Design an enzyme around this catalytic site. Structure first.
Site, PDB file in Angstrom:
ATOM      1  N   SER A 149       0.866  -1.162   0.000  1.00 12.08           N
ATOM      2  CA  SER A 149       0.000   0.000   0.000  1.00 12.08           C
ATOM      3  C   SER A 149       0.922   1.238   0.000  1.00 12.08           C
ATOM      4  O   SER A 149       1.879   1.307   0.790  1.00 12.08           O
ATOM      5  CB  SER A 149      -0.873  -0.028   1.249  1.00 12.08           C
ATOM      6  OG  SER A 149      -1.656   1.145   1.264  1.00 12.08           O
ATOM      7  N   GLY A 150       0.690   2.131  -0.956  1.00  7.57           N
ATOM      8  CA  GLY A 150       1.516   3.324  -1.135  1.00  7.57           C
ATOM      9  C   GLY A 150       2.746   3.138  -2.012  1.00  7.57           C
ATOM     10  O   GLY A 150       3.533   4.075  -2.146  1.00  7.57           O
ATOM     11  N   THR A 154      -1.542   2.469  -8.234  1.00 10.09           N
ATOM     12  CA  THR A 154      -2.584   3.317  -8.839  1.00 10.09           C
ATOM     13  C   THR A 154      -1.981   4.332  -9.812  1.00 10.09           C
ATOM     14  O   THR A 154      -2.521   4.515 -10.900  1.00 10.09           O
ATOM     15  CB  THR A 154      -3.460   3.925  -7.739  1.00 10.09           C
ATOM     16  OG1 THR A 154      -4.153   2.862  -7.087  1.00 10.09           O
ATOM     17  CG2 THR A 154      -4.453   4.926  -8.245  1.00 10.09           C
ATOM     18  N   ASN A 196      -1.136   5.500   3.001  1.00 10.33           N
ATOM     19  CA  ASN A 196      -1.305   6.197   1.720  1.00 10.33           C
ATOM     20  C   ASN A 196      -2.425   7.247   1.857  1.00 10.33           C
ATOM     21  O   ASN A 196      -3.557   6.891   2.164  1.00 10.33           O
ATOM     22  CB  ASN A 196      -1.624   5.150   0.596  1.00 10.33           C
ATOM     23  CG  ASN A 196      -1.703   5.690  -0.817  1.00 10.33           C
ATOM     24  OD1 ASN A 196      -1.598   6.888  -1.076  1.00 10.33           O
ATOM     25  ND2 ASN A 196      -1.837   4.809  -1.774  1.00 10.33           N
ATOM     26  N   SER A 199      -5.171   6.083  -0.689  1.00 13.75           N
ATOM     27  CA  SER A 199      -5.312   4.629  -0.680  1.00 13.75           C
ATOM     28  C   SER A 199      -6.534   4.173  -1.459  1.00 13.75           C
ATOM     29  O   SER A 199      -7.583   4.767  -1.291  1.00 13.75           O
ATOM     30  CB  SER A 199      -5.429   4.145   0.757  1.00 13.75           C
ATOM     31  OG  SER A 199      -5.485   2.730   0.791  1.00 13.75           O
ATOM     32  N   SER A 200      -6.411   3.103  -2.277  1.00 11.53           N
ATOM     33  CA  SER A 200      -7.555   2.531  -3.009  1.00 11.53           C
ATOM     34  C   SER A 200      -8.263   1.590  -2.040  1.00 11.53           C
ATOM     35  O   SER A 200      -7.637   0.642  -1.552  1.00 11.53           O
ATOM     36  CB  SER A 200      -7.074   1.728  -4.223  1.00 11.53           C
ATOM     37  OG  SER A 200      -6.108   2.414  -5.010  1.00 11.53           O
ATOM     38  N   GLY A 445      -2.426  -5.872  -2.120  1.00 12.79           N
ATOM     39  CA  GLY A 445      -1.817  -7.165  -1.826  1.00 12.79           C
ATOM     40  C   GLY A 445      -2.113  -7.640  -0.411  1.00 12.79           C
ATOM     41  O   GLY A 445      -3.021  -7.123   0.255  1.00 12.79           O
ATOM     42  N   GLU A 447      -2.009  -8.209   3.493  1.00 14.82           N
ATOM     43  CA  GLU A 447      -1.894  -7.259   4.593  1.00 14.82           C
ATOM     44  C   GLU A 447      -2.257  -7.885   5.907  1.00 14.82           C
ATOM     45  O   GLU A 447      -3.079  -8.805   5.955  1.00 14.82           O
ATOM     46  CB  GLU A 447      -2.735  -5.989   4.350  1.00 14.82           C
ATOM     47  CG  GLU A 447      -4.237  -6.212   4.266  1.00 14.82           C
ATOM     48  CD  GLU A 447      -5.072  -4.950   4.241  1.00 14.82           C
ATOM     49  OE1 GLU A 447      -6.134  -4.932   4.903  1.00 14.82           O
ATOM     50  OE2 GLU A 447      -4.663  -3.974   3.571  1.00 14.82           O
TER      51      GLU A 447
END
Ligand SMILES: Nc1ncnc2c1ncn2[C@@H]1O[C@H](COP(=O)(O)OP(=O)(O)O)[C@@H](O)[C@H]1O
Ligand SMILES: [Mg+2]
Length: 760
Positions: A149-150, A154, A196, A199-200, A445, A447
């Site tokens: 994440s981050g 994206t 993030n 973040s998505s 992914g 986590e």
């Protein structure tokens, strides 16, 4: 002589071996004579002779190993070269600042039709290779963007989409719609998390569809697992979906009045999280005083190089206009968002001599009124639906149960609004038919946190299925071709994870099916579900009780209060509280009929023993996605997060090394370097050239003509290897392979002329 040996924060450090002992080497750090440290023999790696150089493809390194790979991407990163190859796989390290001109229209044009390696490594080159493969092989393609994440998934997804629409579109409005769809999806599906700022909170597969002439005809967006818990509550450092803040920061006074909006601290669904806006000195002055929370006034704005709530509201409204959204549809979306905000301000107090019931707090009168008007509901039906339960008889709800009903209604309305927005985006770039597509996968992914719920379970389940696809495509299918062709490539093995996938998704016995059973029972219980999982999988190696954990945080967790999944990415202890509630996508009948019977047409259209499995709905979506990935050619981008601080020029060696290892990048280094990413049959090559050949060339067996062709062009035994039926080209030989494959009549005639002259 200098080697790479471990370092706690840098991953590796340079040194010289000055001694050897049992299971150890003594390392003297470079230029620190007399000083020594011990390292395990297998943790010491040869270093490149030239410490200052950098290579575009890591397969070009004399010694390719985890240490030289780390060093090469580090040197490149210090010079703002964020993209590096591992043969035809791209490594992208997040810069955390905008590098000038590297995504310009001019850069886009310089990558068009260029072979891999001809231009510096770039996301544009991965996108162009996908297009050229699609066009030549007449096969749809997938680009998979992976990482933490981050890490940059994206952003790189959008670079791919912009490269392909701008390069292979027409030059019309439709081309930009695929790109302009981003501010809209991100407004409703992205949010500030601790890892993030953007973040998505949903996964997506974005397909660009092409006709037979390999020109863009339209697109299709598939969305997965929108995080519903976020809609109602967040941690103090996190925010709800961007839309709420863009609307509060940017909406005109007219809209603010109509929607009864105010500063974010006045809404329960926003005020447990961070109530500050992303703004800079300029945009802060564009935000009116009545939009600013007390915390924004004391602490100032949130800082980000990309995000700006006021600026992003303007850009979102522009994107809505550009894709074909009428002003009325934009206002219908804003009204639902505000309705959800006002719904959250409906408060309850205990009622009854034994606190068996509840009443709306007298101070929630305005909230009930605003909510009913915005959602087209009668105030009394809303009040009754939130405070009683139908079972012929209307029984009082306890305060906790009324809170859950309000929150369930909020989550369903918002999630239905997100489904509507994704569908509306698909409607702005439709296609009746297409020959092929290029799909870009952007999904979070594996986590794990101190507390893992149904959201982590679903994404980590997803990861187990995607990891298997990666193993099968990169390792299994590749090496079976090398083996069938008699290439003698050293074998890289993996342990399959079908046992972990089956544990979660098998029919009747899998966790998802056991959870659905609990939801269908007369009185569902998280404890009954967890005990059923343990009782069914007592002999399963991937499952354990939380007491078996190697951490003190899980010590007090009861057998029926959780379970540990021993994922290959690491053991994850799941707390099973709210799993039954989180597994149901359907509203209770009272709330469903209330919202289905709204006075507002748009609300009715969002909804145009109540139970719908969240787990099995996702399993079906994921199997559809896996069908597409297995039937297409795959390209991979590994995004790397350089630090945990969102800062530029801060390379955390050990953090990056861990990502290189956990991604499986280190494990495939020898395979990638000793591999053959480019190949074609002797028969197809001979058949393409055959009509241009004189008798002397056509008389040669296909394999012999190929040898003559390659010799005439000065290609050597280093660059290629002959298999049983195919010729195979090495990493970094894509330009030479593409010259061999180029089907243009003038080109084919010229190479044949060169072969004729060489033969003389
Ligand atoms: N190539 C890039 N150029 C500029 N900024 C970038 C780049 N890649 C990532 N970023 C920055 O990092 C942030 C996080 O990246 P993002 O794509 O959202 O991560 P992910 O989707 O993997 O969680 C972005 O919002 C942006 O600020
Ligand atoms: Mg993302």
């Amino acid at each position: 002589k200098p080697v790479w040996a471990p370092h706690p924060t840098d991953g590796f450090q340079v040194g010289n071996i000055v001694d050897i002992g049992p299971d150890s080497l003594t390392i003297e750090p470079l230029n620190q004579k007399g000083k020594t440290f011990l390292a395990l023999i297998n943790q010491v790696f040869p270093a490149e002779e030239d410490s200052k150089k950098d290579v575009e493809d890591n397969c070009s390194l004399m010694y390719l190993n985890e240490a030289t790979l780390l060093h090469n991407i580090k040197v490149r990163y210090s010079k703002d070269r964020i993209y590096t190859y591992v043969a035809n796989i791209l490594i992208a390290v997040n810069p955390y600042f905008d590098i000038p001109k590297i995504y310009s229209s001019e850069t886009i044009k310089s990558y068009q039709g260029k072979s891999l390696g001809t231009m510096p490594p770039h996301v544009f080159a991965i996108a162009d290779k996908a297009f050229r493969d699609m066009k030549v092989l007449k096969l749809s393609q997938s680009i998979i963007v992976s990482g933490e994440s981050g890490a940059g998934k994206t952003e790189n997804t959008k670079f791919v989409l912009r490269y392909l629409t701008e390069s292979y579109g027409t030059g019309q409005d439709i081309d930009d719609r695929i790109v302009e769809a981003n501010p809209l999806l991100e407004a409703f599906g992205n949010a500030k998390t601790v890892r993030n700022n953007n973040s998505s909170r949903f996964g997506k597969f974005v397909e660009i569809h092409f006709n037979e002439k390999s020109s863009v005809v339209g697109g299709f967006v598939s969305h997965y697992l929108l995080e519903k818990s976020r809609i109602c509550v967040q941690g103090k450092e996190e925010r709800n979906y961007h839309i709420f803040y863009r609307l509060c920061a940017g909406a005109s006074e007219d809209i603010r009045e109509r929607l009864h909006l105010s500063s974010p601290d006045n809404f329960r669904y926003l005020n447990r999280g961070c109530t500050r806006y992303f703004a800079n000195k300029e945009t802060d002055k564009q935000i009116l005083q009545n939009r600013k929370s007390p915390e924004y006034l004391k602490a100032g704005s949130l800082k980000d190089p990309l995000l700006d709530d006021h600026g992003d509201f303007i850009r979102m409204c522009t994107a809505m206009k550009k894709i074909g959204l009428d002003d009325e549809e934009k206002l219908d979306l804003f009204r639902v968002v505000a309705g959800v905000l006002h719904l959250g301000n409906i408060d309850f107090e205990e009622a009854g001599s034994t606190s068996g019931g509840c009443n709306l707090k007298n101070k929630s009168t305005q909230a009930l009124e605003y909510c009913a008007e915005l959602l087209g509901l009668d105030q009394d039906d809303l009040r009754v639906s939130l405070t009683t339960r139908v079972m012929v008889i209307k029984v009082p709800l306890k305060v906790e149960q009324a809170n859950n009903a309000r929150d369930a209604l909020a989550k369903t309305v918002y999630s239905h609004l997100f489904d509507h927005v994704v569908n509306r985006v698909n409607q702005c770039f439709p296609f009746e038919t297409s020959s092929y597509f290029i799909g870009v996968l952007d999904i979070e992914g594996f986590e794990y946190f101190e507390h893992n719920s149904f959201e982590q379970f679903c994404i980590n389940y997803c990861n187990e299925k995607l990891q298997q696809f990666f193993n099968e495509r990169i390792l299994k299918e590749e090496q079976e071709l090398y083996q069938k062709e008699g290439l003698g490539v050293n074998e890289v093995h993996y342990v399959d994870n079908q046992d972990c996938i089956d544990l979660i998704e098998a029919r009747l016995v899998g966790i998802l099916d056991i959870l659905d059973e609990e939801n269908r029972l007369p009185q569902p219980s998280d404890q009954h579900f967890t005990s059923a999982v343990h009782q069914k999988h007592k002999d399963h190696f991937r499952l354990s009780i939380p007491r078996k954990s190697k951490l003190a945080i899980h010590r007090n967790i009861r057998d029926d209060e959780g379970f540990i999944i021993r994922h290959f990415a690491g053991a994850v202890c799941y707390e099973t509280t709210q799993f039954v509630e989180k597994n149901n996508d359907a509203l209770h009948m009272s709330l469903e009929s209330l919202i289905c019977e709204s006075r507002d047409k748009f609300i009715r259209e969002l909804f145009e023993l109540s139970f719908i499995s969240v787990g099995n709905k996702f399993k079906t979506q994921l199997n559809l996605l896996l069908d597409k990935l297995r039937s297409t050619g795959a390209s991979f981008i590994r995004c790397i997060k350089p630090n945990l601080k969102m800062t530029s020029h801060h390379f955390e060696g050990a953090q990056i090394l861990s990502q290189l290892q956990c991604s499986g990048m280190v494990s495939v280094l020898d395979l990638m370097q000793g591999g053959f990413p480019s190949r074609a049959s002797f028969h197809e090559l001979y058949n393409m050239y055959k009509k241009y050949m004189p008798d002397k060339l056509a008389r040669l067996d296909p394999r012999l003509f190929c040898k003559a062709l390659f010799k005439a062009l000065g290609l050597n035994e280093i660059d290629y290897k002959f298999g049983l039926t195919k010729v195979f080209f090495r990493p970094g030989k894509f330009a030479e392979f593409d010259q061999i494959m180029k089907s243009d009549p003038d080109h084919l005639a010229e190479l044949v002329k060169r072969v004729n002259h060489w033969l003389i």
